[PDB]
């Protein structure tokens, strides 16, 4: 394991609480959901 | 702007850096594009 950094402005910030929060969920994991997701996907 | 941590095991690690590499893209513009994509498909 390791901890790689993520930028993010405000606004997708508050985006991710928002989406995170109205579902019972954190901000890390949705991250983790939409990392995931998308290598799923490829 | 603030920046978060995300915790990835290697084989998450390596899945990135191939899958961006493929594109001519680094780890963390892969990882900016899978947060948009998703909260884009939440609605
Ligand atoms: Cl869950
Ligand atoms: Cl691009």
């Not at 950094?5 to 929060?21: P, Q």
């Not at 109205?22 to 890390?28: A, E, K, L, Q, V």
Request: glycine share 2%.
């Amino acid at each position: 394991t390791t901890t790689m950094g993520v930028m993010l402005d405000d606004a997708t910030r508050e985006r991710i609480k928002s989406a995170a929060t109205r579902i019972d969920r954190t901000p890390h994991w949705l991250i983790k959901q939409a990392i995931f997701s998308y290598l799923e996907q490829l």
